[PDB]
Amino acid sequence: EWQENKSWNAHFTEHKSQGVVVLWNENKQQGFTNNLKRANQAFLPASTFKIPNSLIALDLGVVKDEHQVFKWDGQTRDIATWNRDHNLITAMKYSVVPVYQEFARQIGEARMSKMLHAFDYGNEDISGNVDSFWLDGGIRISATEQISFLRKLYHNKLHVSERSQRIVKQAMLTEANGDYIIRAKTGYSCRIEPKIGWWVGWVELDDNVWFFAMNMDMPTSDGLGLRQAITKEVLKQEKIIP
Amino acid sequence: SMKEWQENKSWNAHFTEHKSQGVVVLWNENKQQGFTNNLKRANQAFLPASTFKIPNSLIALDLGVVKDEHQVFKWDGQTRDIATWNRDHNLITAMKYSVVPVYQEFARQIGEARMSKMLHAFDYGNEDISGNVDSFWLDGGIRISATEQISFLRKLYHNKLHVSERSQRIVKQAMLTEANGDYIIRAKTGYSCRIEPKIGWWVGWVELDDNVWFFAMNMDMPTSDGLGLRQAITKEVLKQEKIIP
Ligand SMILES: [Ca+2]
Ligand SMILES: [Cl-]
């Protein structure tokens, strides 16, 4: 079931914003959120789509392994970290859109649609550019739907090879210490209103796993760090992390 | 500057500062070159102690003794000195807390014949497991040097060991120790505390955006009070060489 804890809204309004956090306790099969309506509202996934895009590119052989080098095309884009060679690990880390646009072109519309239907990923609608539909096209996915998809990935239940799922979970690694491991992906939907930031993933503990998906209003890029900061505030307050 | 192995005695100051002695060995994967404060000790073979949990994990996975990283190894109900051992574990947490009893059971199930054959294929150390099948890495005959640990770890990193790619990916997951926006460390600690010379170990690697740095260190450990020096001295070297900030 789901519990709504409206008191968590303060975590957003104290930053002059609005948003949703969704938590899932895997051992207890219990969900929590500050806002049930928005937890189930579907938005563009923006660069959180790099999780399914990575899986499809690996399973089909577009990407051989996490070491294959994708050479910079020599065109200088706005984010300096994009203007260099990458592998799957660093393309995820710096959210290198052009590398993933090339993945999508090579996958093709037909195979992309077939795979997203098999994943049950959002509204499964890739209209718009084959190479940008997750940024300004027709695909929409909610925070609760992100949890469902991530749970399948965590348990190697998606209809792609076990190897592809293990490689993407490695590439999602974001933080690790003696208390917890976070595997996750950020997103920033900055073209189509409502402009929002995403953070989706999970926290591995010794004894349990907490899945999470959050999004928040993002009228400018100045607030992007609040995606992880707000989430961690909630995790700390609830004694999931120290 | 073309030498495969180069001695840099300036790192000794990190040992001297902590009234300690030992060896740090680094390997720059992009440049295929190595660095150490003590070439002689870098090539001296010691009991691996709990750094042996890396090969032991690989063998148990590949033979099916361990199904995967979620299988639960129930506590046998016997209360031992390290409190974190006295509970149920999986591969991730058994590696993290270095739960010896779990891996002793692994070794008994693998058996001496299959254990010997696998270490031979791994070319691991002196490949000699005389002693108890269940404790030879703690007080038996197997010995491995720091440079030999590097070579073995490089094989693991590239999935070049003879076991399945899946077994190798799982163990590399279980070796995860630290990760942030600057680096990822996959490593395993050890403490040889039964047979002289008593020593501590830390072996593994540091993943950067555009390179990997393998490391293996051991140091004299007359009592357990200095165990934190294994990571501290290693990190002091990594900082001096600008590998981590
Ligand atoms: Ca595959
Ligand atoms: Cl990992």
Author numbering:
A (entry chain A): 24 to 265
B (entry chain B): 21 to 265
Provide passages from the article that reported this PDB entry.
The active sites of class D carbapenemases such as OXA‐48, which is of major clinical importance, uniquely contain a carbamylated lysine residue which is essential for catalysis. Unlike other classes of SBLs, class D catalysis requires carbamylation of a lysine residue, which occurs through the reversible reaction of carbon dioxide/bicarbonate with the lysine ϵ‐amino group. We report the application of 19F NMR spectroscopy to investigate carbamylation of the class D SBL OXA‐48, a major clinical cause of carbapenem resistance. Crystallographic studies on 19F‐labelled OXA‐48 provide a structural rationale for the sensitivity of the 19F label to active site interactions.
We anticipated that a 19F label situated near the active site of OXA‐48, which has no cysteine residues in its wild‐type sequence, would be sensitive to its carbamylation state, so enabling the factors influencing this post‐translational modification to be investigated by 19F NMR spectroscopy. Thr213, which is positioned on the β5‐β6 loop, is poorly conserved among class D SBLs. As OXA‐48 T213C* was judged to more closely resemble the wild‐type enzyme (although, as noted, the 19F‐labelling did apparently impact kinetic behaviour), it was chosen for subsequent 19F NMR studies. Notably, unlike our crystal structure of 1,1,1‐trifluoroacetone (TFA)‐labelled metallo‐β‐lactamase SPM‐1,18 clear electron density representing the TFA label was observed in the OXA‐48 T213C* structure. The trifluoroacetone label is present in its hydrated (diol) form in the crystalline state. Hence, our 19F NMR studies in solution likely represent, at least normally, the hydrated state of the TFA label. Comparison of the OXA‐48 T213C* structure with the structure of a carbapenem‐derived OXA‐48 acyl‐enzyme complex implies the overlap of the TFA label and elements of the carbapenem acyl‐enzyme complex. Consequently, the 19F label must be displaced from this position following substrate or inhibitor binding, as manifested by changes in the 19F NMR spectrum (3 C). The presence of the 19F label in OXA‐48 T213C* close to the active site likely causes the observed changes in kinetic properties when compared to wild‐type OXA‐48. However, since these differences are relatively minor, and as the carbamylation of the 19F‐labelled enzyme behaves similarly to what was previously observed for wild‐type OXA‐48,5 the presence of the label does not appear to have a major impact on carbamylation and enzymatic activity, suggesting that the positioning of the label in OXA‐48 T213C* is dynamic, and does not obstruct access to the active site.
